[PDB]
């Protein structure tokens, strides 16, 4: 048992038993592992676009093909071993040695690494991919060479890495089937050097069966920092004194593009024309209005986050020319012409060869808002004669399905999160290497194939972010393919659900004090949620 006034209870991102703390497997690692235990070279702030120096004291392009990091002086692993340039070197090079490591692809465009001293890392690139490099700067955890040095590729990839040895503000304390506990590392270098200190001695990641459970926890003050979707926000504020980012609708920040991935390898979902018909049959308005009660924004056919820097590169003409809209009569007309007609009289269209068509549509059990949205979609598909069958597997199975591509229709917001570049969005959708992967963690979960996109993705990647004209043109070419072939159908912008209660901790950020992004998802703590810990104050 932990002293309540020195413990902060977080929930919203833990939907399976804690069973993995491996920095090399970010898809399985318990939320907080990267961020609270492992650190990155930079923080990234979605509120501003700022890269704030963490392990790195500075980072600079020296010329077009050479990037230099200079580490802060006085960084230490938790076992008092100095964290140096060779740890950063190792973090990259281990992935050239063991190609199974998820970022081994970096060595296709990174040539080599130099370390002139204990603080300096120089990356020389053969093909500098600026967009993806910017993202690595705040997402790639730095790992201890002295710990991983002697491990083979199988250990690295399969180890659960209990009690991770990192450099961050917390260590793993304890866990069970329904919670992860972190304990603050008092001798953290970060406090000595940066002068910041996380206020809670204990951070507990709470696992819960369903969003509905979270509400009770919040009302009784058993949850402090909630990323769970919950309905009736005005009533939550007025009656139960629960707070959100904005005083007024939409109440929450937007964090993701929520849409449907389709199995592009399964007939008839393999037909671009059929996929278009699905897209034209779905009206997100009732989802936005009724499921979320206006706490989210509807997406246009391209699906660029309106609050993101992707809008800097918005291919306006392309969307107006090639985008789809809700148009069920035209959806029926398309299906007719393709020969998808009802021959047995059950209201559902069969294949041109008279074969029945039934498509599973899925999201995790307990994600109440997506379960409702899915039935809205089922009901909408019903009236154009498409038989969609709702399926709500455990989260663990939902993700296994996603990674293996074992689904028909899948509601998805994995990898479509706000970022420093629209490249992350197009990469998540088109991820060409999914086609050669049993497990695709990165994207293109339905295994869509296209001979142009890989070249287009690379060309975008290697274009300096300040060449607005060229980045925009490439977003247009990529967007054009997206809108024409619809491997992913954008539907709305996911709410960054963030609800707090002040009986134990105060000084949360909100629209009047907008100092940090409030996201406790795995691999997002370095975008603001850790910073929130630096700023929390005990309640009086």
Ligand X SMILES: OC[C@H]1O[C@@H](O[C@H]2[C@H](O)[C@H](O)[C@H](O)O[C@@H]2CO)[C@@H](O)[C@@H](O)[C@@H]1O
- Contact (CB, 8 A) for 259 and 491: yes
Among 87, 95, 467, 413, smallest CA distance to 254 is for 413
Q: Give the distance from CA 445 to its chain's centroid.
A: 14
Q: Tell me how far, at minimum, the Cβ of 497 lies from ligand X, in Å.
A: 5
Cα(33)–Cα(14) distance, rounded to whole angstroms? Answer: 12
Where in 237-276 is the site for ligand X (CB under 6 A)? 256
Q: Is 340 in the site for Mg ion (CB under 5 A)?
A: no
Cα(91)–Cα(149) distance, rounded to whole angstroms? Answer: 10
Instruction: Kindly state the tokens that stand for 318.
Output: 């392309």
Q: Tell me how far, at minimum, the Cβ of 540 lies from ligand X, in Å.
A: 30
Q: Tell me how far, at minimum, the Cβ of 211 lies from ligand X, in Å.
A: 5
Residue keyed to tokens 């001695």: 201
Cα(516)–Cα(411) distance, rounded to whole angstroms? Answer: 28
Q: Give the distance from CA 130 to its chain's centroid.
A: 20
- 80 interacts with, out of ligand X, Mg ion, none, CB within 5 to 8 A per kind: none
Comparing CB distances to Mg ion, the nearer of 162 and 346 is 346
Q: Tell me how far, at minimum, the Cβ of 343 lies from Mg ion, in Å.
A: 6
Q: Tell me how far, at minimum, the Cβ of 335 lies from Mg ion, in Å.
A: 12
Where in 370-389 is the site for ligand X (CB under 6 A)? 370
- 497 interacts with, out of ligand X, Mg ion, none, CB within 5 to 8 A per kind: ligand X
Comparing CB distances to Mg ion, the nearer of 285 and 389 is 389
Number of Cβ within a 10 Å radius of residue 346: 11
Q: Please identify which residue in 80, 177, 187, 344 interacts with Mg ion, judged by CB under 5 A.
A: 344
Preceding amide of 161 cis, omega within 30: no
Cα(424)–Cα(446) distance, rounded to whole angstroms? Answer: 17
Cα(57)–Cα(42) distance, rounded to whole angstroms? Answer: 9
- 346 interacts with, out of Mg ion, ligand X, none, CB within 5 to 8 A per kind: Mg ion
Number of Cβ within a 10 Å radius of residue 35: 27
Comparing CB distances to ligand X, the nearer of 138 and 367 is 367
- The count of chain residues that interact with ligand X, using the rule CB under 6 A, is 17
Task: For the sheet with 56-63, list strands across it.
Answer: 56-63, 66-71, 120-125, 110-117
- The count of chain residues that interact with Mg ion, using the rule CB under 5 A, is 4
Q: Is 362 in the site for ligand X (CB under 6 A)?
A: no
Where in 201-220 is the site for ligand X (CB under 6 A)? 211
Q: Is 227 in the site for ligand X (CB under 6 A)?
A: yes
Cα(109)–Cα(200) distance, rounded to whole angstroms? Answer: 42
Q: Please identify which residue in 108, 114, 176, 342 interacts with Mg ion, judged by CB under 5 A.
A: 342
- 413 interacts with, out of ligand X, Mg ion, none, CB within 5 to 8 A per kind: ligand X
Interface with ligand X by CB under 6 A: which range of 12-20, 197-205, 353-361, 452-460? 12-20
Interface with Mg ion by CB under 5 A: which range of 180-188, 246-254, 338-346, 430-438? 338-346
- Contact (CB, 8 A) for 513 and 24: no
The DSSP call for residue 104 is G
Cα(226)–Cα(107) distance, rounded to whole angstroms? Answer: 39
- Contact (CB, 8 A) for 101 and 24: yes
Q: Is 413 in the site for ligand X (CB under 6 A)?
A: yes
Q: Please identify which residue in 135, 369, 410, 485 interacts with ligand X, judged by CB under 6 A.
A: 369
Q: Give the distance from CA 242 to its chain's centroid.
A: 25
Comparing CB distances to ligand X, the nearer of 181 and 205 is 205
403 three-class SS: helix
Q: Is 353 in the site for Mg ion (CB under 5 A)?
A: no
Q: Is 403 in the site for ligand X (CB under 6 A)?
A: no
- Contact (CB, 8 A) for 428 and 416: yes
Interface with ligand X by CB under 6 A: which range of 137-145, 302-310, 364-372, 454-462? 364-372
Interface with ligand X by CB under 6 A: which range of 366-374, 376-384, 508-516, 531-539? 366-374
Residue keyed to tokens 């998808």: 340
Alpha helices per DSSP H over 65-152: 85-97, 130-139, 145-148
Q: Is 229 in the site for ligand X (CB under 6 A)?
A: yes
Comparing CB distances to ligand X, the nearer of 95 and 522 is 522
Q: Please identify which residue in 274, 348, 370, 399 interacts with Mg ion, judged by CB under 5 A.
A: 348
Interface with Mg ion by CB under 5 A: which range of 181-189, 254-262, 342-350, 461-469? 342-350
Instruction: Kindly state the tokens that stand for 314.
Output: 């918005």
Q: Is 494 in the site for ligand X (CB under 6 A)?
A: yes
Number of Cβ within a 10 Å radius of residue 523: 21
Q: Tell me how far, at minimum, the Cβ of 252 lies from ligand X, in Å.
A: 10
Q: Tell me how far, at minimum, the Cβ of 350 lies from Mg ion, in Å.
A: 5
Instruction: Kindly state the tokens that stand for 44.
Output: 């990234």
Q: Please identify which residue in 134, 308, 414, 440 interacts with ligand X, judged by CB under 6 A.
A: 414
Q: Is 291 in the site for ligand X (CB under 6 A)?
A: no
- 342 interacts with, out of Mg ion, ligand X, none, CB within 5 to 8 A per kind: Mg ion
- 344 interacts with, out of ligand X, Mg ion, none, CB within 5 to 8 A per kind: Mg ion
Where in 510-529 is the site for ligand X (CB under 6 A)? 521
Beta-sheet pairing, 202-206 with 56-63: unpaired
Breaks (C-N over 2.5 A) in the chain follow: none
Beta-sheet pairing, 202-206 with 7-11: parallel
Interface with ligand X by CB under 6 A: which range of 61-69, 223-231, 309-317, 385-393? 223-231
The DSSP call for residue 45 is -
Residues that bind ligand X (CB under 6 A): 12-13, 15, 211, 227-229, 256, 367-370, 413-414, 494, 497, 521
């Amino acid at each position: 048992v932990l002293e309540r006034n020195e413990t902060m209870y977080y929930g919203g991102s833990l939907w399976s038993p804690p069973s993995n703390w491996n920095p090399f497997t970010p898809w399985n690692a318990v939320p907080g592992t990267t961020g609270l235990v492992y650190e990155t070279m930079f923080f990234y702030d979605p509120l501003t676009g700022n890269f704030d120096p963490w392990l790195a004291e500075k980072g600079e392009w020296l010329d077009s093909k050479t990037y230099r990091v200079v580490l802060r002086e006085g960084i230490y692993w938790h076992d008092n071993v100095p964290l140096t340039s060779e740890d950063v070197r190792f973090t990259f090079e281990i992935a050239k040695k063991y190609k199974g490591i998820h970022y081994s692809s970096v060595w296709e465009w990174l040539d080599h690494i130099e370390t002139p001293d204990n603080r300096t890392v120089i990356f020389v690139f053969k093909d500098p991919r600026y967009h993806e490099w910017n993202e690595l700067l705040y997402t790639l955890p730095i790992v201890p060479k002295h710990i991983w040095e002697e491990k083979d590729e199988t250990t690295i990839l399969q180890s659960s890495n209990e009690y991770p040895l990192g450099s961050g503000p917390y260590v793993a304390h304890s866990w069970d089937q329904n919670k992860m506990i972190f304990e603050r590392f008092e001798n953290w270098w970060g406090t000595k050097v940066m002068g910041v200190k996380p206020a809670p001695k204990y951070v507990v990641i709470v696992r819960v069966l369903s969003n509905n459970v979270a509400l009770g926890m919040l009302m009784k003050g058993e949850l402090d920092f909630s990323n769970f979707m919950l309905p009736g926000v005005p009533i939550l504020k007025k009656v139960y004194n629960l707070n959100t980012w904005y005083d007024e609708p939409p109440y929450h920040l937007s964090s993701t593009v929520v849409g449907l991935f389709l199995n592009a390898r399964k007939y008839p979902l393999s037909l671009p024309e059929f996929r278009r018909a699905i897209a034209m049959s779905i009206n997100a308005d009732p989802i936005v209005q009724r499921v979320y009660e206006g706490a989210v924004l509807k997406a246009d056919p391209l699906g660029f986050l309106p609050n993101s820097v992707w809008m800097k590169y918005y291919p306006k003409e392309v969307v107006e020319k090639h985008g789809f809209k809700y148009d069920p009569e035209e959806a029926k007309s398309i299906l007719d012409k393709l020969g998808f007609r009802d021959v047995n009289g059950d209201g559902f269209r069969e294949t041109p060869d008279g074969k029945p068509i039934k498509l599973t549509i899925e999201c995790p059990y307990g994600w109440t808002d997506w379960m409702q949205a899915i039935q809205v979609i089922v009901d909408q598909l019903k009236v154009v004669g498409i038989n969609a069958e709702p399926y709500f597997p455990d989260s663990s199975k939902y993700y296994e399905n996603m990674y293996k591509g074992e689904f028909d229709i899948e509601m998805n917001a994995n990898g479509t999160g706000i970022s420093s570049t629209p490249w992350t969005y197009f990469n998540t959708i088109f991820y060409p290497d999914a086609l050669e992967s049993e497990f695709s963690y990165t994207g293109n979960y339905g295994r869509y194939q296209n001979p142009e996109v890989e070249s287009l993705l690379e060309e975008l990647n290697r274009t300096p972010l300040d060449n607005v004209e060229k980045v925009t043109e490439l977003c247009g070419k990529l967007g054009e393919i997206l809108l024409k072939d619809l491997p992913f159908i954008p539907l709305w912008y996911g709410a960054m659900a963030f609800i707090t209660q002040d009986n134990v901790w105060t000084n949360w950020p909100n629209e009047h004090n907008p100092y940090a992004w409030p996201c406790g998802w795995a691999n997002w703590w370095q975008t603001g949620a850790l910073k929130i810990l630096f700023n929390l104050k005990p309640a009086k």
